[PDB]
Design a protein around this ligand. Structure first.
Ligand SMILES: CCCCCCCC/C=C\CCCCCCCC(=O)OC[C@H](COP(=O)(O)OCCN)OC(=O)CCCCCCC/C=C\CCCCCCCC
Ligand SMILES: CCCCCCCC/C=C\CCCCCCCC(=O)OC[C@H](COP(=O)(O)OCCN)OC(=O)CCCCCCC/C=C\CCCCCCCC
Ligand code: HEM
Ligand code: HEM
Ligand SMILES: C[C@@]1(c2ccc(Oc3ccccc3)cc2)OC(=O)N(Nc2ccccc2)C1=O
Ligand SMILES: CCCCCCCCO[C@@H]1O[C@H](CO)[C@@H](O)[C@H](O)[C@H]1O
Ligand SMILES: CCCCCCCCO[C@@H]1O[C@H](CO)[C@@H](O)[C@H](O)[C@H]1O
Lengths: 49, 422, 442, 101, 108, 59, 271
């Protein structure tokens, strides 16, 4: 039954700031996105140039 | 700063009954009760009442389909229509300060429908859908067949439009139905969270589809037939009944009490029903999951009484027979004087709880305010109920064992017995 | 008028029996009433070993106590026309009775006896063990619930909220009479319980019987200590359970919610009111005010859809769920996400005006009878540690405007990583990345 | 006096769709409003409209018109769709007005 | 249709070939040369036009018109290099595209 | 909290993200060209006409 | 059928550019000076005008780099025309063809083959006769003898006159004695086509049953003839005034009379 289903462990992949299950993941969200989007925004600058 | 209030109840010269009640609730729930239903249909217009139920959102002379829906939603209101084989209720709920708004719509829908040909054509395929979801409960299917086996006419008519007629109902049929049934003398404008003078005013100054008793329904003739639907389901639902008591029939309370004495539904979650003669009996007979209950219906000119079961296919035989013995055993004085005392409590309780919700209170008021333009005090009703001897009950029980029975069952009926083996 | 009716509603009385318990009730003039105890317990309080205990308990809480074995317990309740129901969830449990106000006291005794002296019949346990296993197979066919379980299973993966209320197959097959016992003693405790009642009952008469049956007082400060649960981490992710043999598909998408105490919840509930809900039997059809509902009808996008703002102590799930044919999932998700974007970006005053009215009548509806009102009381003290009148709610609702809906919605929704659960014939539902993009601009 | 009537009758005749057996309404460009109205027409009125149109297209491809005796007469032209079309537009404007807050 | 990306007769085409197009989840770098070949084509055409605008097809002027392009046209030399080498890049990519095809039996 | 500040002010709204890329490019170009030209001329000190010019300049 | 129409206008514009750059290639006197007049039209654009023209020229006047780039353009554009034709027919098939009565033809459709394949091949040979007759018996009826004289940068022909298909527009360009004003009138004379779909007030699609519009229609056609004729004459009385009249009425018929009359006709139908 579905009750016996659980999401595997993604610690071998999680970013450092969301590795701990008892910590809000929202507090590190803006940084996690700010960084990824920074890469993208920079690639856009290099491309425009 | 509000307090208590009276349950007024005028009754205009044209026969329209008006019952109101201020409970100072922040929410008002008005409704238009009417004596209409599949009961009044004939072979020719079968299902017309079902479609009419779904046609509530169609355009009227006063409001368009669009404004009816947008208008009512504009003020967090709602509009719905409930119906039985013999009565149709159109009620609207909304916050007090919007009763005026919502009212225009309730009015238009019940008295000024336009049943535009195209809107109607578009709506009919809905009958298929509405009916498909309803029939997901086996309960609904067997009750349909039940009334079809119990009667030869009127009440025998199904509550959901038969398939061969989906798409064939006409605007003329809807109009003629409304004209010959939605008459001032068969209607009642009931309301809660309102002031009689206000509700009373709306009725008279707005309700125009006029007087008369309209076309009267044919009398309900008992058949005592037997319909079996072999559909292969692991569970077998079966119902066995006998002509019971009619609405208001003195013999009503007797069956009500016998109902609660035999077993009228669970009271404890996942708990067994000990106070249930019928359940306890079936339980002793079968080891597998099942369900048994006392069935009971009261209509204007008739009623049905018996038991409804649900059991695995292989044990249907024993489960149904077990339920039968519990009825005989009861017809043969096998009813304690304390049993009748307990049942009378569950009955008084049930009734009293039924009116906790706005939907239940309004339905109680209007139901009675329709079939007798009056209102029995919750004490007189209790006074009438407990004043039911142990004899009465045993008699009701006898009337069942001796009366001609009709039966309906569906599922893998390979082990389900025929009415003449009970 | 409306206002006046809100002010004239009888106030909710509260008192605390220094042993830790709280007794609250709302008085009316009804010969009938409902009373029960709302416990701050649930699957979230369980762990890997005792998951499904509180549920296993919920099954025995009605099969008899020490003072009175099964048959005796049932007969007594049945014979008085009272109704005994209850439920167990993730952060909240409840056992309540519907009966004649005339029996409020005997009931309170019965409640106390249930929560304190459950027989936990060794033989009944093995019997319910098989019943529960059957209920898990019954519920496994309830897509909507399989879907919300999965939504929690991934939204809160690795934590406590990830577990289901019913528990595991292994737990149910091996939970011990001692475990259930331990569960009860550990959680069913005065400071974490609320005796709620509504109908025609004397608050004092209620509190009196309360003192009489809920007596055991505490000495230390830790016995008056309600344990704060550890945080449950939210995770933008998805779980895809595919079975093309299923007729329809269920999809649920959600972002992390604030949690009970947060005022923003009034705004989220207004927002959800704008989007509303729908199913193929809403006569309103193509004229429904909910844009998503309109589109659903027009394009036949789904069989039904619903928004939700599920709260908890410190978190919540704000999202929506829909059922659609395998070939219309993509368009539905497209419009659903599209509407969320409109919320954060282009909400109208008209939109909220309507949503507000809709919300008011919705709150008023959750107080329709003694049981629903009682449930409000239990839940309110247990979550807000106090009852919140309809007048307060209306006060808060009235303050909400388009701008507010946008900021709040932009706050919890815009450019967030959602949690996704899809069950059934879901091949048409595009990948996470595509869905993730539906979280911004529009 | 009867100026407008005179003018309309002249135009009708000058227009000439009646030479193909078409009613004024048969000639309307099928925009959204018209398409909706057409769907509300009773079966017979609809089938009749269709024949008149197919017949006219046949005349158009043949480069012929109908014999003068079969031309529709100004006063016998039946405005079969106008009533429907007006309701349709009336409804549309209501939705439009209403959706503007 | 609810969203333009699918109803519009032109976008519909872009959507069905570069947006919603179903692609195998495991194709490797060897499946990159199709798009690269497309870009060479667009690149070659664009640089070719630019060169053609200063070229002169006549035996007495061909050689020098190319010289004129590389020596006098703003970035003429650059555009010529990009065109001449682009042709090589085109063949490198077509050969690898072919290799991938033979190896993975794409020719089926 | 630069990544955080940058996200809210620049990267969140698609509009602001676009303005950030425009100015970013403007700034980048000016700096990249200058630095690039410097690095190139430095690796070729004394070989460019820029370096030699003064000897024959005599306007 | 707005998309079919709009792409239709793009096709016209592209064909115009094509014919222009193509006409310049033989490099006769008319090729050169026409290339001079046309390119200098762009210099009328304020601020960027001079800059764009010199850019397009690749120098300070129409010269060799103009010629070589024009050849390349002339070679390329025809293919853009072919491609956009596919888009044209693609939008068209979304609805299929309209027809002379302007009423739905769903009740009476027929396969393109062999009905229109045969009809089309017939139309082909009918138009092919004049074409070949002209080309084979009167090769130079339409060209300017001036183009049989090698371009001379220093001598401008006395009467610079464009190819017949550009005369009406040229006429309009000259109506406005102000450089920029005349250029705008010229641009508008063609771009006015993008506006047509929005000036439709008739409740009927075609003009078949609209006698007043039909008159207005032929007036417009004749107005075009007048402009064509005017564009071939020298700027002098009475041409100048006749020209401005025709120009003014051209725009008046399209922007005012057509929608106005369309509305007027609706009322005469009692709509
Ligand atoms: C000084 C120079 C002046 C510059 C003027 C040019 C102005 C150009 C600015 C336009 C604005 C760009 C902003 C795009 C916004 C859309 C967007 O979402 O980002 C692009 C989006 C990213 O998505 P997310 O990471 O989810 O971002 C979501 C954040 N809300 O897609 C991309 O990754 C595209 C960017 C990658 C560019 C790929 C090009 C690489 C190729 C290299 C070859 C070199 C170029 C030579 C050009 C030759 C052509 C003739
Ligand atoms: C632009 C550049 C201008 C260059 C000069 C323009 C060329 C002038 C040569 C004349 C062209 C020949 C047209 C003569 C046709 C005569 C004719 O049959 O007219 C009547 C006839 C009646 O048809 P129905 O109303 O359907 O009735 C049928 C039965 N009920 O009408 C038609 O044929 C339809 C009209 C189509 C022809 C239009 C061609 C005119 C060409 C000029 C370009 C104009 C457009 C530019 C606008 C800006
Ligand atoms: C499939 C794309 C193309 C390929 C493979 C290609 C290849 C080449 C090659 C091999 C050369 C010789 C380069 C050299 O000088 O050493 C060449 C020359 C040239 N190509 Fe292309 N070309 C392509 C497309 C085009 C297009 C579309 C045009 C013009 C519209 C064009 C115009 C020219 C011109 C003018 C030259 C002569 C100038 C020069 O030699 O640099 N080419 N091309
Ligand atoms: C290179 C130019 C063009 C080509 C090759 C072309 C080709 C076609 C073809 C083959 C058709 C279908 C048959 C027909 O009805 O004639 C068509 C129809 C049409 N074209 Fe063009 N066209 C061209 C230019 C234009 C222009 C300049 C306009 C408008 C400014 C235009 C507007 C249309 C429209 C609206 C139709 C619809 C016909 C109907 O009423 O059914 N076309 N075109
Ligand atoms: C064939 C012709 C032409 C073709 C299409 C035209 O349409 C335009 C094309 C591009 C830009 C503006 C108009 C204009 C001229 O090209 C050309 O040189 N001429 N000759 C000419 C003579 C005097 C003044 C202006 C032009 C054309 O007629
Ligand atoms: C925009 C990029 C286009 C790449 C070319 C891919 C080919 O070709 C196909 O024709 C069909 C019918 O017209 C369309 O529905 C499809 O989308 C299209 O891919
Ligand atoms: C052979 C040329 C046919 C005209 C191109 C139409 C193609 C667009 O047509 C669409 O595909 C339908």
């Amino acid at each position: 039954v579905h009750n016996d289903v659980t999401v595997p462990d993604f610690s071998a992949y999680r970013r450092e700031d969301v590795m701990d299950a008892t910590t809000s993941s929202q507090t590190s969200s803006e940084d996690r996105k700010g960084f990824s989007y920074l890469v993208t925004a920079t690639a856009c600058v290099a491309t425009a140039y | 700063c509000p307090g208590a209030e009276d349950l007024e109840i005028t009754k205009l010269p044209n026969g329209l009954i008006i019952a109101s009640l201020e409970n100072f609730s922040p929410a008002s729930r008005i409704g238009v009760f009417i004596k209409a239903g599949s009961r009044y249909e004939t072979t020719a217009n079968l299902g017309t009442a079902h479609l009419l139920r779904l046609a509530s959102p169609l355009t009227t002379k006063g409001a368009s389909s669009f404004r009816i829906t947008r208008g009512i939603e504009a003020v967090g209101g709602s509009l719905s229509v409930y119906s039985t084989r013999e009565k149709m209720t159109y009620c609207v709920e909304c916050l007090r300060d919007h009763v005026d708004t919502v009212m225009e719509y309730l009015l238009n829908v019940t008295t000024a429908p336009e049943f535009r040909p195209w809107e109607v054509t578009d709506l009919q395929p809905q009958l298929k859908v509405d009916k498909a979801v309803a029939f997901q409960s086996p309960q609904v299917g067997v009750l349909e067949n039940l009334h079809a086996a119990a009667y030869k006419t009127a009440l025998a008519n199904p509550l959901y439009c038969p398939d061969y007629r989906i798409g064939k109902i006409t605007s003329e049929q809807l109009h003629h139905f409304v004209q010959n049934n939605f008459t001032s003398a068969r209607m009642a404008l009931v309301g809660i969270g309102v002031k009689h003078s206000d509700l009373k005013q709306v009725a008279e100054q707005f309700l125009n589809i006029r007087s008369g008793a309209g076309t009267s329904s044919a009398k309900a003739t008992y058949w005592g037939g037997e319909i079996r639907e072999q559909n292969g389901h692991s569970l077998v639902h079966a119902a066995v009944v006998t002509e019971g008591a009619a609405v208001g029939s003195a013999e009503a309370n007797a069956f009500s009490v016998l109902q609660h004495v035999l077993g009228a539904g669970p009271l404890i979650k996942r708990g067994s029903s000990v106070t249930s003669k019928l359940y306890q009996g079936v339980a002793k007979a079968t080891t597998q999951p099942f369900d048994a209950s006392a069935f009971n219906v009261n209509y204007s000119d008739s009623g049905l009484f018996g038991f409804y079961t649900i059991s695995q296919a292989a044990h249907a035989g024993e489960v149904i027979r077990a339920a039968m013995n519990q009825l005989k055993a009861a017809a043969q004085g096998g009813v304690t004087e304390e049993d009748v005392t307990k049942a009378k409590n569950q009955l008084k309780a049930t009734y009293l709880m039924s009116v906790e919700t706005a939907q239940g209170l309004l339905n109680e008021i209007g139901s009675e305010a329709l079939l007798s333009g009056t209102h029995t005090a919750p004490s007189v009703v209790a006074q009438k109920i407990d004043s039911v001897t142990s004899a009465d009950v045993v008699n009701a029980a006898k009337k069942f064992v001796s009366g001609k029975k009709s039966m309906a069952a569906s599922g893998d009926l390979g082990s389900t017995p025929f009415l003449d083996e009970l | 008028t409306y206002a006046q009716t809100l002010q004239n509603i009888p106030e909710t009385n509260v008192t605390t029996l220094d042993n830790g318990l709280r007794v609250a009730s709302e008085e009316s003039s009804q010969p009938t009433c409902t009373v029960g105890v709302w416990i701050g317990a649930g699957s979230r309080y369980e762990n890997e070993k005792n998951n499904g205990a509180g549920y296993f308990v919920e099954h025995l809480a009605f099969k008899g106590t020490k003072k009175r074995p099964c048959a005796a317990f049932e007969k007594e309740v049945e014979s008085m026309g009272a109704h005994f129901n209850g439920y167990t969830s993730r952060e909240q449990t409840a056992f309540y009775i519907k009966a004649l106000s005339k029996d409020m006291p005997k009931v309170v005794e019965l409640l106390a006896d249930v929560v304190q002296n459950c027989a936990l019949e060794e033989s009944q346990i093995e019997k319910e063990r098989g019943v529960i296993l059957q209920e898990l197979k019954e519920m496994d066919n309830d897509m909507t619930n399989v879907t919300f379980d999965y939504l929690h299973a991934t939204a809160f993966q690795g934590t406590a909220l990830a577990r289901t209320v019913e528990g595991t197959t292994e737990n149910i097959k091996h939970l011990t009479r001692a475990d259930l016992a331990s569960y009860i003693d550990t959680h069913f405790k005065a400071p974490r319980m609320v005796l709620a009642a509504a109908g025609g009952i004397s608050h004092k008469e209620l509190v009196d019987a309360a003192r009489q049956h809920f007596s055991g007082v505490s000495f230390t400060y830790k016995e008056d200590a309600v344990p704060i649960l550890p945080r449950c981490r939210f995770t933008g992710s998805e779980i895809r359970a595919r079975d093309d043999a299923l007729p329809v598909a269920h999809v649920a998408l959600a972002v992390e919610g604030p949690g009970w105490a947060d005022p923003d919840n009034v705004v989220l509930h207004v927002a959800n009111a704008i989007i509303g809900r729908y199913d193929r039997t809403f006569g309103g059809g193509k004229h429904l005010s909910s844009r998503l509902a309109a589109l659903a009808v027009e394009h036949k996008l789904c069989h039904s859809f619903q928004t939700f703002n599920t709260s908890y102590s410190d978190t919540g799930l704000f999202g929506f769920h829909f059922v659609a044919d395998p070939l219309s999932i993509d368009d539905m998700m497209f419009c659903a996400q599209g509407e969320w974007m409109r919320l954060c970006t282009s909400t109208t005053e008209s939109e909220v005006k309507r949503a507000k009215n809709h919300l008011r009548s919705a709150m008023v509806a959750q107080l329709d009878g003694t049981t629903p009102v009682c449930e409000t009381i239990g839940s309110h003290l247990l979550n807000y540690g106090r009852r919140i009148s309809l007048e307060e709610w209306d006060s808060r609702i009235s303050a909400v405007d388009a701008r507010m809906v946008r900021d709040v919605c932009s706050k919890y929704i815009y450019d967030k990583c959602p949690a996704l659960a899809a069950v059934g014939p879901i091949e048409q539902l595009l990948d996470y990345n595509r869905i993730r993009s539906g979280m911004y601009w529009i | 006096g009867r100026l407008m009537d005179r003018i309309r009758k002249w135009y009708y005749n000058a227009a000439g769709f009646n030479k193909y057996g078409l009613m004024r309404d048969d000639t309307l460009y099928e925009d959204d409003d018209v398409k909706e109205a057409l769907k509300r027409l009773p079966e017979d009125l609809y089938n009749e409209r269709m024949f008149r149109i197919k017949r006219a297209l046949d005349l158009s491809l043949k480069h012929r018109i109908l014999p003068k005796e079969q031309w529709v007469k100004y006063e016998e032209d039946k405005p079969y769709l106008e009533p429907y079309l007006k309701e349709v537009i009336r409804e549309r404007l209501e939705r439009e007005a209403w959706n503007k807050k | 249709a609810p969203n333009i990306r699918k109803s519009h007769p032109l976008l519909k085409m872009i959507n069905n070939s570069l947006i919603d197009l179903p692609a195998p989840s495991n194709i490797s770098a060897w499946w990159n040369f199709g798009s690269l070949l497309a870009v060479c084509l667009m690149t070659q055409i664009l640089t070719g036009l630019l060169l053609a605008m200063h070229y002169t097809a006549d035996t007495s002027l061909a050689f020098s018109s190319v010289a004129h392009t590389c020596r006098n046209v703003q970035y003429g030399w650059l555009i010529r290099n990009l065109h001449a080498n682009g042709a090589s890049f085109f063949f490198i990519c077509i050969f690898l595209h072919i290799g991938r095809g033979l190896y993975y039996g794409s020719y089926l | 909290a630069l990544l955080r500040q940058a996200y809210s002010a620049l990267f969140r709204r698609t509009s602001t993200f676009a303005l950030t890329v425009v100015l970013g490019a403007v700034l980048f170009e000016r700096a990249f060209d200058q630095g690039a030209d410097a690095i190139f001329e430095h690796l070729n000190e004394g070989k460019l006409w820029k370096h030699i010019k003064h000897k024959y300049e005599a306007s | 059928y707005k998309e079919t129409w709009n792409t239709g206008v793009i096709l016209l514009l592209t064909l115009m550019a094509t014919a222009f750059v193509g006409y310049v290639l033989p490099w006769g006197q008319m090729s050169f000076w026409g290339a001079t007049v046309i390119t200098n039209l762009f210099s009328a654009i304020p601020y960027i005008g001079h800059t764009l023209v010199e850019w397009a020229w690749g120098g300070f006047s129409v010269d060799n780099p103009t010629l070589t780039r024009f050849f390349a353009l002339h070679f390329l554009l025809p293919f853009a025309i072919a491609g956009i034709t596919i888009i044209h027919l693609t939008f068209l098939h979304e609805s299929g063809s309209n027809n002379p009565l302007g009423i739905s033809s769903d009740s009476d459709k027929i396969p393109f083959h062999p009905y229109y394949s045969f009809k089309d091949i017939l139309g082909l040979t009918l138009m092919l006769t004049p074409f070949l007759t002209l080309a084979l018996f009167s090769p130079n009826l339409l060209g300017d003898p001036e183009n049989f004289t090698p371009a001379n940068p220093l001598v401008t022909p006395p009467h610079i006159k464009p190819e017949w298909y550009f005369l009406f527009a040229y006429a309009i360009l000259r109506s406005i004695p102000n450089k920029l004003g005349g250029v705008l009138a010229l641009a508008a004379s063609v771009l006015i086509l993008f506006l047509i779909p929005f000036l439709h007030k008739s409740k009927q699609r075609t003009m078949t049953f609209r006698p007043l519009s039909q008159t207005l229609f032929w007036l417009l056609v004749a107005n075009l003839l007048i402009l064509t004729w005017i564009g071939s004459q020298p700027v002098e009385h009475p041409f100048i005034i006749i020209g401005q009249m025709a120009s003014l009425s051209y725009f008046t018929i399209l922007l005012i009379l057509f929608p106005t009359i369309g509305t007027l006709e609706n009322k005469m139908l009692n709509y």
